[PDB]
Amino acid sequence: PKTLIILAHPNISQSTVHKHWSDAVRQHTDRFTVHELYAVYPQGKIDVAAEQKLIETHDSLVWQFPIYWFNCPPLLKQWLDEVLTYGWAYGSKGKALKGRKIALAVSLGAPAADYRADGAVGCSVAEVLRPFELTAKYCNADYRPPFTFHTSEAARQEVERSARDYLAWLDALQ
Amino acid sequence: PKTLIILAHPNISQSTVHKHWSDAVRQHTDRFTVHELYAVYPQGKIDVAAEQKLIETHDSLVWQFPIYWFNCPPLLKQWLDEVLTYGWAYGSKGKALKGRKIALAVSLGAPAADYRADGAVGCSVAEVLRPFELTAKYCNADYRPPFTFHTSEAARQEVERSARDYLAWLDALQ
Ligand SMILES: Cc1cc2nc3c(=O)[nH]c(=O)nc-3n(C[C@H](O)[C@H](O)[C@H](O)COP(=O)(O)O)c2cc1C
Ligand SMILES: Cc1cc2nc3c(=O)[nH]c(=O)nc-3n(C[C@H](O)[C@H](O)[C@H](O)COP(=O)(O)O)c2cc1C
């Protein structure tokens, strides 16, 4: 099957990076499925059954989102809590993610130079994303290296380049 | 002023640890203010102005919540994104948290032995909570060591003891 992209962005219209990323991926619907949580669940009423079946019908799983306060948007956190249930994602009968490739595709609003021991943040991007790595590993998934991008003509071209790199990263994952 | 406790638990009624913690703190309303996000905002419509003013009228700030998927409950993440705005919590005019004591009070559903290099999780609790530490530090707050507890008669007594320790930790923070 194809790769399922769980895209969580509270306002993708005002988005530049994720909007470009989303557009690029929707050009190959036979290879990827862009699932926009905020668009599908504008009231936050996640359909667990629907979400789980979507994952089962796909192969690799990707969580795409902007890094807000060194974390994910709220709807993604809710998605994790309500979709990865005991008996499905983990626990005795829960093997839905066992051996499944899981990776993150994220954007950061600070320079990469900041996420270093000698940088303003003092921590690496990997240390920041640890919660999601632990989540995937807990469910016995095959956690893969994340796709990252740190955020106007030249700038616009760079974002376009990132979108192309994202596609390549996606294919590699497959 | 007193300490403001931002308590984020999606179902505190079915809670045992946080329910006991909350009850213990509400015994001293002249020292602490328990602000239950899910009870105050059952529809997720956070009143930013109200939240910010609440923090300004208090001294130390505490975020109390159960660790769900090595992270916080969704409403707390939303709270962080919507309340810590540019010009208030950070940025040129944003000094609302500057020098303010910020700490977390959390419960974990796995033994402490798991959160070690030689444990099932492979990471420490500190590495897990990093996102919140970075958030507080980014806003120039005085991040303090967190209060942690790893989760029936003897068990019930231990939870009661944890509630007492929480109070002591709270006073120390003050
Ligand atoms: C509430 C709020 C919190 C933010 N926190 C962070 C932060 O912790 N680290 C970071 O990399 N960027 C931070 N940002 C910036 C966004 O990551 C950046 O603007 C985003 O990648 C751009 O979105 P887009 O890619 O959809 O255009 C924050 C922005 C907002 C809006
Ligand atoms: C959706 C879901 C995800 C959970 N994830 C974790 C986990 O990452 N680490 C952990 O310490 N406990 C985990 N737990 C267990 C809770 O932390 C534990 O049951 C909680 O502290 C108990 O709540 P109470 O203290 O209000 O009684 C999870 C529970 C649920 C319900």
CA dist., res. A142 & res. A60, Å (int): 9
| Token couple for A21 | 């990323």
Full domain range(s) for residue A152: 1-174
Q: What DSSP assignment string belongs to B97-139?
A: STT-EEEEEEEESS-GGGSSTTSSS-S-HHHHHHHHHHHHHHT
Q: What separation, in Å, do the N-terminal and C-terminal C-alpha atoms of chain B show?
A: 10
Q: How are beta strands A32-36 and B61-66 bridged, if at all? A: unpaired
Half-sphere exposure of B79 (CA within 13 A, CB side): 25
Structure tokens at A60: 């690799």
Considering only CB atoms, which chain B residues are within 8 Å of A77?
Answer: 68-69, 71-74, 77
Query: Rounded CA gap, B139 and B93, in Å?
Result: 11
Q: CB neighbours (10 Å) of residue B34?
A: 19
| Best mutation target, B9, B79, B83, B134, to test chain A (most A CBs within 10 A) | B134
The closest alpha carbon to A8, from A56, A42, A32, A31, belongs to A42
Q: How many CA atoms lie within 13 A of B45 on its CB side?
A: 2
Resolution in A, one decimal? Answer: 2.0
CATH code for the domain in which residue B35 is found: 3.40.50.360
Phi, psi torsion values for B65, nearest 5 degrees: -165, 160
Q: Which two tokens stand for residue B78?
A: 């939303």
Could you write out the DSSP letters of every residue in B57-85? TSSSEEEEEE-BTTB--HHHHHHHHHHS-
Residue A5's nearest CA partner among A23, B19, A13 is A23
Residue B22 CA: which ligand is closest?
A: 2
Q: Specify the residue with its C-alpha closest to ligand 2, atom 2.
A: B68
Please give the structure tokens belonging to residue B151.
Answer: 């989760």
d(CA A68, CA B142): 21
- Number of structural domains (chain B) is 1
Distance B134 CA to ligand 2 centre (A): 22
What distance in Å separates residue A70's CA from the closest CA in chain B?
5
Name residues whose C-beta falls within 8 Å of residue B45's C-beta, 6 or more positions apart in sequence: none
